[PDB]
Design an enzyme around this catalytic site. Structure first.
Site, PDB file in Angstrom:
ATOM      1  N   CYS A   1       0.858  -1.167   0.000  1.00 42.38           N
ATOM      2  CA  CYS A   1       0.000   0.000   0.000  1.00 42.38           C
ATOM      3  C   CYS A   1       0.878   1.195   0.000  1.00 42.38           C
ATOM      4  CB  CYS A   1      -1.018  -0.071   1.139  1.00 42.38           C
ATOM      5  SG  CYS A   1      -2.195   1.030   1.388  1.00 42.38           S
TER       6      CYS A   1
ATOM      7  N   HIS B   9      -9.438  -4.556  -2.697  1.00 46.76           N
ATOM      8  CA  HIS B   9      -8.494  -3.726  -1.986  1.00 46.76           C
ATOM      9  C   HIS B   9      -8.926  -2.196  -1.975  1.00 46.76           C
ATOM     10  CE1 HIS B   9      -4.215  -2.599  -0.828  1.00 46.76           C
ATOM     11  NE2 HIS B   9      -4.706  -1.467  -1.259  1.00 46.76           N
ATOM     12  N   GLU B  10      -9.265  -1.660  -3.159  1.00 48.03           N
ATOM     13  CA  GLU B  10      -9.790  -0.259  -3.291  1.00 48.03           C
ATOM     14  C   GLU B  10     -11.126   0.046  -2.692  1.00 48.03           C
ATOM     15  OE1 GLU B  10      -6.073   0.110  -4.880  1.00 48.03           O
ATOM     16  OE2 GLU B  10      -7.405   1.580  -3.828  1.00 48.03           O
TER      17      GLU B  10
ATOM     18  N   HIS C 144     -10.688   0.609   0.972  1.00 49.48           N
ATOM     19  CA  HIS C 144     -10.267   1.930   1.416  1.00 49.48           C
ATOM     20  C   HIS C 144     -11.413   2.891   1.632  1.00 49.48           C
ATOM     21  CE1 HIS C 144      -5.976   1.865   1.351  1.00 49.48           C
ATOM     22  NE2 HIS C 144      -5.925   1.529   0.082  1.00 49.48           N
TER      23      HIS C 144
HETATM   24 ZN   LIG Z   1      -4.293   0.568  -0.964  1.00 53.69          ZN
END
Ligand SMILES: [Zn+2]
Ligand SMILES: O=C(Cn1cc(Cc2ccccc2)c2cc(Br)ccc21)NO
Ligand SMILES: [Zn+2]
Ligand SMILES: [Zn+2]
Ligand SMILES: [Zn+2]
Ligand SMILES: [Zn+2]
Ligand SMILES: [Zn+2]
Ligand SMILES: [Zn+2]
Ligand SMILES: [Zn+2]
Ligand SMILES: [Zn+2]
Length: 203
Positions: A130, A173-174, A177
């Protein structure tokens, strides 16, 4: 504010615009966007895709001080909005020929979410990393093997899409966030490399 600096026409996103582990923005639930988009939201999404393209171009990455990357979310730029960008390139064959399609996935997604998924889990063999995290973090980041997502484009058009393999892992993953979740939250706490039977390990 941060948004004003990012959308200046001459401003290119670089590592200095990226917030660090510990900044509270990375733990919020980002706010849904409304359509029609403001100009700033539209421009932000385009600058985010531009960041990814630069990050993947050996020269521009060198110029701007960037490493290669395939995903970016607005919270990482200190903007608490449900906007992500993904850019996953296909690879050259062994003779050096370019692929038929440059990208297996290329999108700026507004308000994306997972609407269904497989019972099976998967994880990348090499773990994840990241841009907001400057620590070596080992282990398998356990995710849904396959997902069906919904999202909107910059025009407001709704899309429904099934994903598997690496693209599945990237989009998950996105989205995490924009829900205030970090990759290491999905790493087993006592043995980072533990493998529950049936986990799909991706190479
Ligand atoms: Zn990330
Ligand atoms: O910080 C980043 C860029 N990035 C950096 C490493 C990485 C791994 C996956 Br899977 C997806 C994105 C990744 N995205 O949020
Ligand atoms: Zn900057
Ligand atoms: Zn709201
Ligand atoms: Zn535009
Ligand atoms: Zn450029
Ligand atoms: Zn579920
Ligand atoms: Zn889920
Ligand atoms: Zn639906
Ligand atoms: Zn932990």
């Amino acid at each position: 504010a941060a948004i004003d600096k990012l959308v200046k026409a001459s401003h290119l996103i670089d590592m200095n615009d990226i917030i660090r582990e510990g900044n509270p923005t990375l733990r919020k639930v980002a706010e849904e966007v409304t359509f029609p988009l403001s100009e700033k939201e539209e421009i932000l999404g385009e600058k985010m895709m531009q960041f990814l393209k630069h990050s993947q171009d050996p020269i521009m990455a060198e110029k701007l001080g960037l490493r290669g990357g395939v995903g970016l979310a607005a919270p990482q730029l200190d903007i608490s909005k449900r906007i992500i960008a993904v850019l996953v390139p296909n690879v050259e064959d062994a003779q050096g020929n370019p692929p038929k399609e440059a990208y297996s996935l290329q999108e700026v997604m507004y308000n994306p979410k997972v609407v269904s998924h497989s019972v099976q889990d998967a994880a990348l063999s090499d773990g994840e990393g990241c841009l907001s995290v400057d620590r070596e973090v080992p282990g398998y980041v356990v995710r849904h093997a396959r997902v069906t997502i919904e999202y909107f484009d910059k025009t407001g058009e709704k899309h429904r899409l099934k994903l598997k393999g690496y693209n599945s892992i990237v989009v998950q993953h996105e989205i995490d966030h924009i829900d205030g979740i970090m990759f290491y939250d999905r790493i087993n706490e006592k043995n980072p490399f533990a493998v529950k039977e049936g986990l799909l390990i991706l190479e």
